[PDB]
């Protein structure tokens, strides 16, 4: 059967931890991959978690300079969730340095990018299966959301981006049918930034939140149909969202260009005129995270919330967030229900070592009692390589 | 489809060895978890053995300072019951440091809690999906089974704790249907103690054994109905059941204090007026088990017994032990069949080595010739690490 | 649907290798296990190897002294044919130091023997449920046949033996119908020595071809219907089947006492007149192995034969060897196809190590054309440990 | 329901990165094993990676001097694609040193050559199941494709080669129904050399490729009916296509003899009088890989074609290439889509190392906008053995 999307996202006061995975305190002494962007996509059956793996295993002479992320050996895998990453029980999905993956109720669409920097080439898979291909159009490095799309009706509605990642690029929506590629659209957006876009469906439309890698440290979205007819802006809230950020303040619908010059996967949850930041806890690196709701963020320009949560604690390394949504065909509820992930980043940027590795953690949200805590990776770096 | 649990408990005369695990052996070259407090709890198909992992393996240098207990990366996993606890081949459950699971005829049911001590969270998954968020009430240790609780017509009961560890705390009964909360009932309790129970259904009823932490030598009990109207006492025989007890003599109904002042987990099958009491041999530390039949011990106060079977030598270490029940809907037979199991601890409380980790056995109760052995943890310790 | 043995055995003129096992050469860097013991027993969907694990894995320092065969630690484990026993991919049977096991067409039996020397217990299995237990009659040590039984219709039979290895013991017949034994017949056989026996059926009734480990360097035989009616007596043909026999000359009816004091375990494939006695190529140790037709060799005292085909070379590790079978309700052929395998020994006993396993070769019997060559374990010892 | 081939061969343009399994730098610390000549096949479900493991691990001591191609260790294993072939999640096939697979809609069937050099034996195996067995007639090594058979209407057709590498040999092709040989016909072919294979099935009938490892540096081909009604040449083309090959030239409807002493396994795909080739870069060694679509290179002997795609560097080892098929049973469209594998050699023959292993890609044709890049295998050896 397919999998509607015509009920609204569950109204939501808190968060329960679902998953947390422990790859690198695992990873010492067992066979596990060095991962990247861990998104988590949920199926009528059982949610899995898609990785990038960069070819090699964790402590291990081949993890050197894994810092690089554009290579023809990174390849796109899938495993249960909250199970560590290792090559005797992941499932090979695509070959790719940017991908994406979806279920629309019957089968998993992934997408995945791999080839050269000025011509790279998407390969999209339909319960293993090639079925339809793009190629860039502008010529500079082509990208994907690298968290899981929204299906709606059977049909899966992505978001790619090609051209400069500090100028102007282009920007195109792709609606995808048992995939193959029926309608695309090229975004008309001046003087914005769209990149690694986090998408929900919320009530038979699409809502993505993406970052800003040029000059904005709030972050836009964008919102259409099934016929691919957008609605383009920023989040006006004080509570900024991007990474680096300013101190907060009042915020505006344009982009805000106090500290925005380069910037973190995240995302937000739109419930009218309110929002759900996630966001970091230090304003210049990426350590912490917390669950902030502004009860008018979405279009209000000041920096009073009502709710704040704690997550991962301010001394503690952090990065990549993004959203998946449980829908009432697996949960048995008469709504969506929003989840998110965080990925927890350890490795050479920040520490004395010669790879790059992260853990994730999962939570959704709940009309229950929560507490706030510090679920961090627990490893003891260095190691012996 | 659903399990009844109207039948009566099947009457047995011996033990008969059911699995074997030898985690920490196979541990010092493979990759198993360090685990604590494996329960086993048995569905319509299958049996599965339920762990609490730290987040590390065996000889490794994560496994360092193992014997804390409530860390943000305490995970709940199982695996198929006589199988070593592997990342290659468990399956994840919740993110706890205390934890229970239970099977009702359709899906399985976990309870998780973690959380600060102050503050902590139990969170309720059916099928692997959160259903429903339980809070603490005193701010303190909020505790559960660290067994499979008791389904009976599609309700599953379990027994939380909440205070002090050496004073008086607050105990509550809930009745769980399809992984939400429809009762709950706080026991009046008074100069009683109940802490890590052992349940199991018996003529649609249920029937819990527990651990007196703050004045008891012997075990105090709980029996209720679907509608949670509770029955309280103690198991007054002369075969006291606690680790720290006192040498046989004449026990009592009500807290008997001795050398009672920190127990073990442990259990007990009521058969009218007579017990299976399952203990350890050395009254000081947690070395050996054995199963002792007492025909008149749950009301009559003597230290006078029937059989004795000898499970593990009075020179072996021990450690936690439990109880689970087969259903007809599995076995075949028309009643419910006791069982029970042993974790074998090996580590820092008692050893020289930095790490705490332990192996279990499994037994099931039978009617026919059965032997008594030692079946111990047959690892050489310190390791390599 | 059940299983029926009503069909005759297959003849043939030779042996294809069906599977081997590099279990020594893949230990040496991976996680397998030390086992003993691979008998192989096939369902009507798959073959499994059933092997008899240690409680170690192979080049670990828990693998000391691994030529004791009579411990708590061993249990009776299985994997699918042609594979490794792993940790990761093996399924765990029971706790046994003797064991054999079988598929009746719906669900799998096994026998598990496992206490100690004096009054050993052994456990049956259901479908992984314990369904009934026997305890030993002569109380000195208690042996089941170490290979899969034959099962005629639902009803299964095994042979257990118990008494002393170098005098008379006693000899018993069971017949087990899900699970449960029915039926036990004590062979009436003074001056005759049963021990380790190979068993399949041919014409709704059962031929096992056991070890006389007392008196003779021939091999004895028993056959019987679903009655459990016997009938006893010893292989005559001039080409002896056990590992300490003598020169080729001419045999006997009863046992021939000129070199026969040990034993090691085998079969035979009756054929009317004639016998596929499968021994080693040396008589003295246990090295090199061959199969050999003689066509009046069941009642016919003579050296002569037919065929002889070559399966390990003469100065090749050899060990137990025993026979397995192929139901038409799995291959589709209108008869029963005889099958074998054999052990590959390497360890203490006869190398100088600290350890002692074995791997596994499998053959089927065709009317096609086979060639005989050597398929030896090519571990190279001494491990580093 | 069984394939039934029956329609032509999909037009492409362009080829699709499929599948990379990065096996060597992987086995640097995981377990793999040490494979040659990988294949896939696919089946109406998934496709398999099929591999001739030489009974070791990767980075092990008994990797040493795996370049004897013909023991008695080497076993036929398969895996799902894009996975690293490892004990612990392969499947055992059969016992061979020379070997082809194949799924006809209903159930595997493999081929496997293993006995001595004049005498080896092929045992064919139907869902697992020894169904016939076939012997050398010339009393030569007997070879088999090393690749994936062609399966029309459930009969599955392949080639075997018997007699010199050197010299004349001969050759034969089967029909297998059910695993049984239905009809074989030796090919008479005076001063051709057929052996290594590539079969596809196009409208109903079965076309191959092969290597001439005698006098050849373009490829031979044959092209047969159901009822083996055979044709042969050469691919009349100046684009050559074994590794050893002259420069481009006009080539020749015979046996071009330039540097034809030698040769690797190769493929192409025929499109009435045009070829898709795939060869290597470098005319001496294997290093490199590309394809090549000549409009009439099936029958016109010019040097001129008109697209070319770059899949390995120049600079980048190289090996083995074949071709496979996905079935309109299984992608879903009305015609046959072409697709093929890469071996990536690295080892002893051309490197400072002990052992000999290769990793794999594969391909599958596309009419969609595709990229040519270098997908090497980026092992950095020497290992630590």
Redesign the interface.
Known sequence: VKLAGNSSLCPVSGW?????D?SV??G?????FVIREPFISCSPL??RTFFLTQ???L????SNGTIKDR???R?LMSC?????P????????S?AWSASACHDGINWLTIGI???DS???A?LKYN???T????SWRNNILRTQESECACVNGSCFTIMTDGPSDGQASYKIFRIEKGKIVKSVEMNAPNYHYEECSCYPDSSEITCVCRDNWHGSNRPWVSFNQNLEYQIGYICSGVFGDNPRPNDKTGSCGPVSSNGANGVKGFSFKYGNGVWIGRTKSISSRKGFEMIWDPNGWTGTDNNFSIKQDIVGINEWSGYSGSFV?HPE???LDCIRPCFWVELIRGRPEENTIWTSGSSISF?G?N????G????D???LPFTI
Chains 1, 2, 3, 4 share one sequence.
Do not use: M
């Open positions: 329960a931890i679902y998953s947390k422990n305190r695992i010492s002494k067992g066979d596990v059982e949610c070819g090699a295993l402590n291990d002479k081949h290579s023809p050996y390849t249960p969730i909250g199970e560590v290792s090559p005797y029980n992941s499932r090979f999905e070959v791999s080839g050269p011509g790279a080439v390969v293993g299966i090639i339809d291909t793009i190629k449980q697996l949960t048995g959704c709940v229950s009692d929560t507490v805590w510090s679920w961090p627990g490893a003891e």
